[PDB]
Amino acid sequence: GRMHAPGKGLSQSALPYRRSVPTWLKLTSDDVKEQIYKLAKKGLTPSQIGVILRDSHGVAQVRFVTGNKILRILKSKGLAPDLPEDLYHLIKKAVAVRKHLERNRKDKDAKFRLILIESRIHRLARYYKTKRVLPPNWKYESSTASALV
Amino acid sequence: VRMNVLADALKSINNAEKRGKRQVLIRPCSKVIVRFLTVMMKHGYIGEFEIIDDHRAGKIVVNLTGRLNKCGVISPRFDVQLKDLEKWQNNLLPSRQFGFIVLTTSAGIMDHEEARRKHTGGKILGFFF
Amino acid sequence: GKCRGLRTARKLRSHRRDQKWHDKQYKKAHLGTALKANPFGGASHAKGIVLEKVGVEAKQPNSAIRKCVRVQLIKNGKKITAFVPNDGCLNFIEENDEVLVAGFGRKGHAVGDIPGVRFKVVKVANVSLLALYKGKKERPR
RNA sequence: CACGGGUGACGGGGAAUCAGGGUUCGAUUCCGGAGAGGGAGCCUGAGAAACGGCUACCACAUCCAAGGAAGGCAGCAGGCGCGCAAAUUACCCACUCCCGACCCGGGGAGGUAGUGACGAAAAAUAACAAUACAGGACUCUUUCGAGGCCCUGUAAUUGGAAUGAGUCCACUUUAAAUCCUUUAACGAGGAUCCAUUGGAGGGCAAGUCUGGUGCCAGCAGCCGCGGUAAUUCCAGCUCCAAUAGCGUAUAUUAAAGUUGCUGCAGUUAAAAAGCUCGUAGUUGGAUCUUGGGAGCGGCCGUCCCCUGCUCGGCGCCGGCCCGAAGCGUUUACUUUGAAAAAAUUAGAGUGUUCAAAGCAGGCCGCCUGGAUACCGCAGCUAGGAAUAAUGGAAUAGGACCGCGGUUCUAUUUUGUUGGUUUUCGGAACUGAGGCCAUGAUUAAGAGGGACGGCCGGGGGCAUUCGUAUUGCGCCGCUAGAGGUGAAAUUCUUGGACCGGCGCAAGACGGACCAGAGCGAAAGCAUUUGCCAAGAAUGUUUUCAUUAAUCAAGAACGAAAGUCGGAGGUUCGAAGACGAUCAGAUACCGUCGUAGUUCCGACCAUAAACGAUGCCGACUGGCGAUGCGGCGGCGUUAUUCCCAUGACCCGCCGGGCAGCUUCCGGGAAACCAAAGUCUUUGGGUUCCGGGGGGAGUAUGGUUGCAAAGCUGAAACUUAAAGGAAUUGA
RNA sequence: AAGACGGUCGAACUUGACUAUCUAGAGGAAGUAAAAGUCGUAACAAGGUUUCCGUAGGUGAACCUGCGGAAGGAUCAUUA
RNA sequence: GACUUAGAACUGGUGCGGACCAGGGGAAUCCGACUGUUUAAUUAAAACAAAGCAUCGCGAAGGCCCGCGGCGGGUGUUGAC
RNA sequence: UGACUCUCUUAAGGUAGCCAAAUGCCUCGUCAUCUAAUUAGUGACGCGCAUGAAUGGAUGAACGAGAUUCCCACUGUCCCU
RNA sequence: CACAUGUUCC
C-alpha cells in the first residue's frame, strides 16, 4: 500500500528467527567495524555498506554481529553524513525532475510527479525535526537544493 | 491502516465461528488480546488457545468450540460507570441469563459480573455471548 | 454516524446541526419567512372583515361549487379566501360582518376538493355558526 | 468559529414528554440581574444614579384667571386600546412576617371572599321485590313439555324502602363572614328533579333501515361518496365511543430507526465531489512484572507481604518492635469522602373517612415524626495501576558511593569582656576518582529509502515511415460521370469520369489490436534516438513509526467554446441549393464558414460510470491472462552445450478479468463485494430527507466572453419513483 | 445667597452619510393552477432519424445539427 | 552647526491661505476613443489625422507614379516582418 | 392582436442589434417621470415617410474651450433700479 | 420514399 501510488505490492526482506551470528562468519565485531569504516571513508550511504557486506564479506546482519546498526556506528565515530540518506535521495530525485522540467515544460506528467517528492520531502522533514537530527529551522528550499548533490 | 488490533482479532474469529472452523489464526498477538482470550476460556466459550511467539508481533492459534454466537468489539473504549453498567448490558447482551460484557478496570480485565464483585468500573472493550 | 472518534463531538454536533436545515419541518419552524408568509402569524384563530362572497369551483372527478368568503384581517390587513364550513350557511353570513377564522386542520395545505383554501369560519358577529345551524342561537338584526 | 448579525433570548432550580437515549418549553410565585414612558445628571442617606425622590430634554397628557402651576398604575383594583386570548374600582390586619420612638400604630406585602368548565382530585343523574315472558345448569320424555331444589335478563306492569340537589333552621366556621361538616323538618315511580359531545364505507367501534336530494346541495383530516335504488349529502329510527364532559383550530412530544451517539441511507427509489496531492482536524502496530509463600473451607474459592528514608513507649539486650508527622513521575479513567439553597423529582411513615392533598398525629402528661436518594457537567481530597497519553542516559551536564580544594555562612565553643582562624551545621563552584550487567526491545504479510534484472499505446522533445484523400502537370480513350428508395442540385467535346507516370499539401496511424498493457483521472498505437519518471517482483540492504482519511489550499483535467499566430487535405455546426412531406425551417443528397490540424494562453464542464469514496483484516473453490521470481521431465534454436531465447508442467505476490454454488446480503435486479448489520461500533472525508418551483432569483467570487462555484423563499402538489410478475 | 468664569458628565436639536423592513412603478421576462382552445407530434415498442449527458450554433414550437462521451441499447456472443 | 515636524499654554471684537496666488460641484443624454491637427482675416468642431482592423498589386525585364527626350528618375543605402 | 396558413414576385426580400435618434413627414406620436404649469429632457413602446451591421451596428471606463436636460450653492439676469 | 392525431368515468 504505497502512499503515493495505487499499488498494494508485498515484497520486502524477511529476517530469520535466530539472532545468533552465523557459524561460517569468523569476522569479529571490530573487524566488521573497520570494514564499515573503510567503506564509509571512501564515500557510501549506509544502505550500500549493508548490501556489499552480505555479498562479498558474507555477514548476515550488522546488528547481530556488532552491538549497533550501521548508521549508529557511523554516528559514534562521526562519519555519518550531515543529513539522512532517505531525505538526501529524495532531494536528489527532486532536483532531477525540476532540471528535466526546465527543458520539457510541456511534460504535465512530470509536473504532477514533482509535487509527490516535495510532499514526501516535507513528511521526512517534519519527522526529522521531531527526532532532533536536523536543526529546528531547517527547511527544504527548491532553488538552493541544487547545491546539494 | 490497522488502527485497532482487538477489533481485527475478534472479527476474524467471528467469521471463522460463523463458518464453524475448528481453530482460527489471528495475525497480531497483544497483551490485551491474551487477556481477552483468558476471559472467554474460564467460561468455556472457546477451545484452548496458544500463541506462537516469534521475534515480532506473534501469531495466536485459537481452538474453537461450537458454543460461540457472536464476539463483538466496542470502539471507541467508552468509560463505564457502575450506575449505567446495567444500561450497557440491557441493549447489548441478548438476555440477563447469559452474555458477558468484558471491560478493562484498574484491577485488571474481567467480565461485568466480576467488576460488580470488586466494585470497580472502567473502559469498555467488547461483548461476547 | 460515520466517524466514531473519542473527541469528535463537535464534528457530530455540526453535522446534525447542518443536516437539520435540510429537514422540511425543522426549516419551517426555524425560519422567519415561514412565519412572515402566514396570515395568522402563529395565531390559532383570528378576526377578519367580510368584503365579498366567492364561489370556488371544484377539482378532478368530484365536481361541485364550494361556498367561500373573502376575509380581510384587522391585525395584518391581509386577505383570505375562507371556506364556509357547513351546508346552507352562506345565507347566515352577511356583508361587512366580523368573522372568527381559523385553519381547517391540514396546517398550511389545501384540503381535498377545495383548491387553495386552508381556512374556515367559526364565529360570525360573536355568534357561533354551529349554533346557527342547530337553531340554538339567532342572529341579532 | 474570533469578530459580526439575528434572537418570536432575563438565566437557573425546573415543566411536558419519553423503554434506552433525546426533543420542546421555562413571561410565571424560589434564587440572582434589569426598570419604573425614553435617555442623562444629582441631593440626602451606611446602603439609590431611587423615580409611591428631585433636576433638565424628548414624546404624551392636565388645570388655568393666559399671569402661571402640575403628572408618570411593567404596585392592588379599575377604564381605553390591542387582540383568539385573560377576574372585583370587595373585606381585613384575624394568620405569615416586616417597619417605626414601638406589647399598643401602619402594611392593595399578605390573608379572606366575588368572577371564573384554565386545569386537577372525589363524586349524583338510582336500588330492591313481586306478575307475564325469552331462557340458562338438573330429572323424566327417542322429540314435545313439565317443577323450579339454583337462577340471568326484558317489560310507563305493580309495590313500597333509602338518600341527595334544592327549600331550609340551630351550632360551627371567620376579624366579621362565606364554603364544608353536624342538626331538625320537607324534598323522587315516566324517581319530568328528563346528559350532553362526536360518529355510524375503511383507518375506527357502531344499519347495506326509511324517506327526500340527483356530480346540485353538500360530505369527507386521507382514501373517497353524490350524475333517481346514496351503507358517506339533509331529516327520522336505531346503534357506537367518552361521560359533566366532549368536539375543532393552533403549537409541541412519542409513534420518526422520516435527523439515526444509541440507531438511517448513498449501483438502479434522494445520493461518492472527475481525479490526485495537501496543513489544520480525527484515528493510530507489537513490546517494559508475573509469580510464590503463611491461613481457612470441600485441585478450586478467600485475607496479608514482596515497599524506602523527624518525634515517643508493652519496651528489651549501639541494635530490634510498634505508634505518630513529612517526602516519594504527571494525568484521563475507576472507587470513596467532604462541600455540596429550598421548592420540584423518586421515595419512608401518616386513614385529609378515600384521593388530589398536608405534615401530622396516637394513648390512658407520655410516645414520637417532620427521613432518605442524586446534584451530574465543573472544582477539592483519598485507594488502584489494566487501558489511552507524556517523559527518562547513547555529543552522557547519566544515576549512586567516598571525596579533595574554593567562596560565603547557622555557630555549639574561645569563663565574661574584643579582633582573627577553623573543627563545625547550611548553600554554591571546581578536579581526581571507584561502581553500574555502565544506558540502545522489535524490525510490523506498516511505511519511507537504497540496490539488481526487467516491464509497460505511461509523459515530454526530436527524427522516420506508410497508404489513402485533395489539388496540379503530362499522356491515352471516351459519351456520359456523381448521388439516391427514386430523382435532382453538381462536372462534362472548353474532354467530365476512368487508367498510367509523377509532383505538392495537410490530416490519420488499418489489419497485428485481445473482456490485453500503462497512467491519479482525463487518457495513451508508424520506425528510431534523447530526457526524466513509474508499478510489480527479488532482497538475511538502510531509517525506525516516519502512518490512514482529510475542510482551507493547490496540480492535472475528454470534447465543445474564447483570445493571438501558423496551416487549412478530409470531415463538418451556421448558411445556400436539390429531393420528401400537408409543411422540413429535420432525417437524404451537393457545396460549405466557424471548427476539426500545430504552438502559446484561458475555460474547469461530461452517462468525467464500476451510476459502486479512501486505508486495514477475515470469509468457498475453478480455469485463464499480464509482469517478475522460483523449481522441474522433456521438444526446439547459437551450434559447440552449459546459460540464455520459444514452448510444456507446477508454485509464489498483485495486475485486469471471467466461471461457478443456498457463505452471506439485498425490495429484487444482482453482488467475493453490494458479506462479515436489530447477534446494529476497525478508521476517516463527502453527501440525501416526498415531487416541483430550481440549480431559479438575489448576494458573494472567477472568467476576455461563454459561462464556472455557493445558493433560497413565496407558492403548488398526494403522489413521484425503484425492482419484479401477468396481459396488451 | 443670587450670579459670573473655566472644566467634567451630558439629555436633546439641526445637518449629512450608511443600513434594516415595508412598498408604488410605465415597461419586460418567469413559475404555478384550470381550457371540450390553436398549432404540430418531441419521448415511452428499433416510437418509425436508438436513447441520454457535456459543449456551441440555428429554428414558431416541441426540437434539429456538429464534436466528444455513456448504455440507463435492440449486441454480454460471430470464429483463419 | 542647522532647518523641519509634532504637542501644550496664553491671547486678540471668531479674526487668521486677512494683500497677492487661487478648481464651483453633482446627476444624466448625443457624438468623437483618447494626446494631436485644421479653414492666417466670421465656422477649433461631431471635421481631418491617429494606433487598431480588413482588403489589393508586386520576387526586379516587377508594383506605383515622374519625365519633351535618352542604358533618364524616385520609392531604392529598398526585397513580402 | 395574432404564432400559423394561402398567394404574387424578384439576386436577397433587413438577420443580430437600435430608434421619434444628428436619422420619423404625420408629430407637440403614446405611456411613465421630471413641473403648479414643459412643442424641452430622460426611460420604454416600433406598422421604421426614409434605422441597421467595416457605405460598419451595438457599447461607451478616461477625456473633450464639442451639442442638450435637471438639481445644490452662488449671485443686479431680473423684480428695480 | 409518408403513415401525423384523436376529452373525461368503470
From Swiss-Prot, chain A:
<feature type="cross-link" description="Glycyl lysine isopeptide (Lys-Gly) (interchain with G-Cter in ubiquitin)">
    <location>
        <position position="26"/>
    </location>
</feature>
<feature type="modified residue" description="N6-succinyllysine; alternate">
    <location>
        <position position="26"/>
    </location>
</feature>
<dbReference type="Pfam" id="PF00312">
    <property type="entry name" value="Ribosomal_S15"/>
</dbReference>
<keyword id="KW-1017">Isopeptide bond</keyword>
<comment type="function">
    <text>Component of the small ribosomal subunit. The ribosome is a large ribonucleoprotein complex responsible for the synthesis of proteins in the cell. Part of the small subunit (SSU) processome, first precursor of the small eukaryotic ribosomal subunit. During the assembly of the SSU processome in the nucleolus, many ribosome biogenesis factors, an RNA chaperone and ribosomal proteins associate with the nascent pre-rRNA and work in concert to generate RNA folding, modifications, rearrangements and cleavage as well as targeted degradation of pre-ribosomal RNA by the RNA exosome.</text>
</comment>
<dbReference type="InterPro" id="IPR023029">
    <property type="entry name" value="Ribosomal_uS15_arc_euk"/>
</dbReference>
<protein>
    <recommendedName>
        <fullName>Small ribosomal subunit protein uS15</fullName>
    </recommendedName>
</protein>
<feature type="modified residue" description="Phosphotyrosine">
    <location>
        <position position="37"/>
    </location>
</feature>
<dbReference type="GO" id="GO:0022627">
    <property type="term" value="C:cytosolic small ribosomal subunit"/>
</dbReference>
<feature type="cross-link" description="Glycyl lysine isopeptide (Lys-Gly) (interchain with G-Cter in SUMO2)">
    <location>
        <position position="42"/>
    </location>
</feature>
<keyword id="KW-0689">Ribosomal protein</keyword>
<dbReference type="GO" id="GO:0006412">
    <property type="term" value="P:translation"/>
</dbReference>
<feature type="modified residue" description="N6-acetyllysine; alternate">
    <location>
        <position position="26"/>
    </location>
</feature>
<keyword id="KW-0963">Cytoplasm</keyword>
<keyword id="KW-0687">Ribonucleoprotein</keyword>
From Swiss-Prot, chain B:
<comment type="function">
    <text>Component of the small ribosomal subunit. Part of the small subunit (SSU) processome, first precursor of the small eukaryotic ribosomal subunit. During the assembly of the SSU processome in the nucleolus, many ribosome biogenesis factors, an RNA chaperone and ribosomal proteins associate with the nascent pre-rRNA and work in concert to generate RNA folding, modifications, rearrangements and cleavage as well as targeted degradation of pre-ribosomal RNA by the RNA exosome. Required for proper erythropoiesis.</text>
</comment>
<dbReference type="InterPro" id="IPR035987">
    <property type="entry name" value="Ribosomal_uS8_sf"/>
</dbReference>
<dbReference type="GO" id="GO:0003735">
    <property type="term" value="F:structural constituent of ribosome"/>
</dbReference>
<dbReference type="GO" id="GO:0005730">
    <property type="term" value="C:nucleolus"/>
</dbReference>
<comment type="subunit">
    <text>Component of the 40S ribosomal subunit. Part of the small subunit (SSU) processome, composed of more than 70 proteins and the RNA chaperone small nucleolar RNA (snoRNA) U3.</text>
</comment>
<dbReference type="GO" id="GO:0022626">
    <property type="term" value="C:cytosolic ribosome"/>
</dbReference>
<dbReference type="Pfam" id="PF00410">
    <property type="entry name" value="Ribosomal_S8"/>
</dbReference>
<keyword id="KW-0539">Nucleus</keyword>
<dbReference type="GO" id="GO:1990904">
    <property type="term" value="C:ribonucleoprotein complex"/>
</dbReference>
<protein>
    <recommendedName>
        <fullName>Small ribosomal subunit protein uS8</fullName>
    </recommendedName>
</protein>
<keyword id="KW-0687">Ribonucleoprotein</keyword>
<keyword id="KW-0963">Cytoplasm</keyword>
<dbReference type="InterPro" id="IPR000630">
    <property type="entry name" value="Ribosomal_uS8"/>
</dbReference>
<comment type="similarity">
    <text>Belongs to the universal ribosomal protein uS8 family.</text>
</comment>
<keyword id="KW-0689">Ribosomal protein</keyword>
From Swiss-Prot, chain C:
<keyword id="KW-0687">Ribonucleoprotein</keyword>
<feature type="modified residue" description="3-hydroxyproline">
    <location>
        <position position="61"/>
    </location>
</feature>
<feature type="compositionally biased region" description="Basic residues">
    <location>
        <begin position="1"/>
        <end position="19"/>
    </location>
</feature>
<keyword id="KW-0539">Nucleus</keyword>
<keyword id="KW-0256">Endoplasmic reticulum</keyword>
<dbReference type="GO" id="GO:0015935">
    <property type="term" value="C:small ribosomal subunit"/>
</dbReference>
<dbReference type="GO" id="GO:0003735">
    <property type="term" value="F:structural constituent of ribosome"/>
</dbReference>
<dbReference type="InterPro" id="IPR005680">
    <property type="entry name" value="Ribosomal_uS12_euk/arc"/>
</dbReference>
<dbReference type="InterPro" id="IPR012340">
    <property type="entry name" value="NA-bd_OB-fold"/>
</dbReference>
<dbReference type="GO" id="GO:0005791">
    <property type="term" value="C:rough endoplasmic reticulum"/>
</dbReference>
<keyword id="KW-0379">Hydroxylation</keyword>
<comment type="similarity">
    <text>Belongs to the universal ribosomal protein uS12 family.</text>
</comment>
<feature type="modified residue" description="N6-succinyllysine">
    <location>
        <position position="53"/>
    </location>
</feature>
<keyword id="KW-0832">Ubl conjugation</keyword>
<comment type="function">
    <text>Component of the ribosome, a large ribonucleoprotein complex responsible for the synthesis of proteins in the cell. The small ribosomal subunit (SSU) binds messenger RNAs (mRNAs) and translates the encoded message by selecting cognate aminoacyl-transfer RNA (tRNA) molecules. The large subunit (LSU) contains the ribosomal catalytic site termed the peptidyl transferase center (PTC), which catalyzes the formation of peptide bonds, thereby polymerizing the amino acids delivered by tRNAs into a polypeptide chain.</text>
</comment>
